[PDB]
């Protein structure tokens, strides 16, 4: 009875190439991972410095700087973060499948309420996609400066620093590919930062310090690169629901969705228990234009994890009848993918679907009392409610209350079916409805002309989806629907 | 500034914590990877027979079998593939990022016809989405039968198997989670096999327990029956395009879908060279009535990279306006993502899209031979053609003359702009076609999107 047991191994030589060319679709990944790492270092400084402001040595300010070099191709990434030590560069940055989060929580094992993103420890290797050679200038507030460099792809180098010191922070020096030199463009850096690291939580100054060349002499021409409040955007999303202002998160959503106007409704809440998360869920003021292009990339719900952008494929996060929601969920326990792009535990995905649709319908109920807003919401996204009515059976009744329709005395204002419930007559044992293209054509139709003689009211609901749904609601409010095809020319009696 | 160099360092603990929870989208993908691997082994032995049929004596019918068991909560998958060598076992299943498929594909180049699906070596690890304990048995044509037993908990144990005699191939025994027993259903297995492996290239037999009369007191019959109801769609794009007849036509269309109706168009082709991909295209005789029902994912073209379904997302592989053509694309050189769910090298996808657009023009001209058939074509799927007119600019001028039109004057005969251009009228100033939701010689445009069509077709070839 031979028994052989072997530990799990890894063929690394294939593995770095696998990660670089298969884990991450775009070369844009070179920047988001390192910027999030700088954010984590800055939060580390904050947590270690509010306990002892003595560690706030030299420059008290915390920031991130991007310093490209068109002449050289060197991509210098200066930050004022925690820096690196020997142990850091060896284990947290220089080892695959290991991150500084594990060691940091192993040091602070009690009350370490820090939701930092540096958990995977493999996003650092995503730099190869733009840079052939990568270098790191890092200096702790306590440890000396050290140089981490790698270009071989199979071996990396570390040398002691003796020249220009940093004091506080890390200066990541890359070398953007000569063919990929478009990444050296300041505009390209700004755009990739906005799309990947928009809400980091610190001013990424982007302040390229000019390589001054003294002295016929030339005047100053590259006076300053754009240090706009786009990369350098400060954190204002950190406010809880108590001090959140409407216009601030309106501008936050404008930035997130590249929009110009605010959002028509806000919903911030913290669902706890087995699943804990905050959810900055809003609604677009206007419908997305992908109604015709149903196969368009639907990037409406931009889920975040620890203030880091993760999700764009909103199709699997929510049932398609609530895929028009634009907002951010900022969780702290959601199991992501290795590429930080899509959510894997699909039982948890279904749980999230149920909770989010419940919250969205509850908000719509809060949006119900104010008539104009809910009328606008009906005009913009009432169709998804119809589809959920048509095939999502569990929340049909909940959706049904949300439904608004036009009736006889209602004129041309869509009122609830519960308004019809509010005005049935005792003789009526089944609710009168009718389907058609227009209200008036069926209003004068003989189907309800026998009904019109008494001044009765009949539901007038008119769309092809309205024609198909009537099959699914067999009976509403405990009473069957009245139609010349549902019941014929039959006269019920008491 | 002294210099120090690193060695290999990859934390095993977080590795498959990420693999189990941060690799694959849906839990049911576990069987798709298993069937893909079994079919890759089957294609390996098919190539081996093509160069040496003698060794195929260990089994003739290249098929796969599925045995659900709600009683034991176990999933059994037995195939007749190339099997496993213990060294291959360790180096590929027991070692991440090592694929025998990639090595075999790069070992030989003359046999470009063969399909080697899979490139990394981690798809087998998707089995831990639902299986608490995974037990994989296999017997290579050369190596003995060694089973694979591990729970992805930092180690794996293998030894010689002495259980059920695997005559030839692999054998995957699963012990799925108790809360996921819904995946042991016969109907669910049918659904996922038809969605993922209906054109796998080999028989898939799904055995089921059948009713027996119980004492009956006279003759108690057998217990079970074996249903090869799956993959009734035999692989025809592998075969030549000449030997396709209306009976194979109808069988392929009716088993590819579940529709009782029949095809309207066939376009079988295979483009080889720098971009090797085959494709079989089949068009319904009617526009589907569930077109406005998004609960049916818009997955008309199932990209079967190397005869295995990879993912039916039509965001890059085929444009939106080709959402009506339900068919199979058999590529051979695609750079799959780590989970076999998305793709990275988008230039290959773009050139494949353009090639498929040209092939769809060829299909339109193929139906252009039969005026009545092409008339039914256009009056059924006019929406997709006009959507393509709006969307694609590369072939915007090419698609114009391939269109048929029922007009206020042509009656029940569909008129073509190609013929209409051939009799171009000098007095004519604009092409006669007016946007509408539904219905000189003036064409009624069947789509509301046709306002964008008149935006696009301002003039075609001087019209
Ligand atoms: N400012 C920083 N710059 C670079 N690396 C940092 C910084 N702060 C911390 N690190 C370390 O970088 C190593 C991690 O890598 P990667 O760049 O792989 O990040 P992650 O852990 O994968 O997540 P993210 O990329 O979101 O930070 C971690 O182990 C973390 O300790
Ligand atoms: N049933 C099988 N038949 C034949 N070979 C198999 C089987 N299962 C695993 N293998 C081999 O072991 C290696 C395992 O693959 P896995 O299925 O683990 O990844 P892949 O097939 O390499 O690609 P991917 O990661 O995209 O699925 C495969 O590459 C294949 O060579
Ligand atoms: Mg990082
Ligand atoms: Mg595989």
Numbering used by the authors:
A (entry chain B): 10 to 224, 267 to 545
B (entry chain A): 10 to 224, 267 to 490, 507 to 530
Reproduce text from the manuscript describing this model.
During 3D particle classification, we observed a substantial population of HSP90 in a more open conformation, lacking RAF1 and CDC37. To characterize this population, we solved structures of HSP90 in which the CTDs are unresolvable, dimerization occurs by the NTDs bound to ATP (ADP + molybdate), and in which most of the MD is resolved and participates in dimerization. We refer to these NTD-MD HSP90 dimers as a “semi-open state”. A semi-open state map was reconstructed at 3.5 Å. The semi-open state structure revealed HSP90 dimers, with only the NTD and MD visible in both protomers. Unlike the closed state structure, RAF1 and CDC37 are unresolvable in this map. Similarly, the semi-open state map revealed HSP90 dimers formed by NTDs bound to ADP-molybdate. In the semi-open state, the src-loop of each HSP90 protomer is directed toward the center of the dimer interface, contributing to dimer interface interactions. This conformational shift of the src-loop in the semi-open state prevents the formation of the luminal cavity observed in the closed state. Similarly, in the semi-open state, F15 and F17 (HSP90-B) interact with F165 (HSP90-A), forming two of the strongest stabilizing vdW interactions (−3.29 kcal/mol and −3.14 kcal/mol, respectively) in the HSP90 NTD, where the β-strand swap occurs.
